[PDB]
């Protein structure tokens, strides 16, 4: 029941992930962000569905959150600047592989 | 109103728990020869119920 | 769910494309032409109605945007001059497979 | 039957528990803190669903009482500040072995 | 088939109780208590559990009952204030043999 991509892996029980199998620690909202787009993977997902789901409903103000959010797992999981979490500006985001 | 509200006794309270005797309703209702039909009746309960 | 048209392949739900071999990329606005003329493929549409549909309501520009857009693709979909993607003046634009 | 975790031990048959290698006083609800959290070794726990299953429902007063019997259960069997007790910010605790 | 612990004997032969042999008796409610003790030696016995096996179901009275038959048992075989059967508090009683 374990989910992964290509190599970054999760944990639903321990929520543990793994960077290809190497340690790492991720604060609890972009963690069940990332197990969202896991759990979609194949989709691509735009920040008001975000900020729909995976953040409260009455949340009326900024909406620079997830920009902010996808810089923090930018930083963290990939150290090439080319991303495996792609990013499609006006439509948000998605999550494949270099082709 | 509970019988146990008139503030009673030990073996009053017993009787009333172990049988099933909850409000002075069903006390109201049943006559002296009713209530006194109970085996191992006291009669410091007689007095006090009457 | 998927969206073909002989030599064009389109899956929305991750929002990807493949022509005789080779994914690319596009804009948001070009690509969601590109879905309402493959949806509504073997369909002539007009462009109050490709406007109407694809962009905003209430877009008070002028009408050359559309022509941009579809010149934008025309140079990533077909190479050939004989046009796969065709145009009738007056009536609109319209996706054909070439004869 | 009798639950273990690397030096942890714990017979729910007589209601004793053990840390490497001795008897610990404990009362009832930390007792029942720590079982709940063996049973879901390899498991996260949080706050709320601790508070649901091994706390009344009905429970009106401030979280931070399961704070406080946390705190206790820290200071009493992970003695040292490392601990096979683990925190986790905003989300609740676990009990892995400290890394 | 006497069921035995250092010095406590029963007998369900003749029904008599014995600490190390010595003369003793037991009313019928502590002498069902001490066969339900000695039955689950080892074994924890909590208040809700006793009154129910070794208490007929129908108790509609409050704990202090076994908590007076319990009084009895100390004062009757374990007259030292320390005692072989051991009290947790809420969790009932257990033959815990001071060591």
Sequence with gaps: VRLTFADIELDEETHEVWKAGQPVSLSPTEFTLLRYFVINAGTVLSKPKILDHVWRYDFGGDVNVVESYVSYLRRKIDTGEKRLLHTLRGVGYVLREPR | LPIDDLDLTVRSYNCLKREG?????????????????IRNFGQKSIDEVK
């Design chain 2, 21 to 37: 005797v909850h409000t002075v309703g069903e006390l109201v209702a049943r006559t002296e020869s009713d209530l006194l039909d």
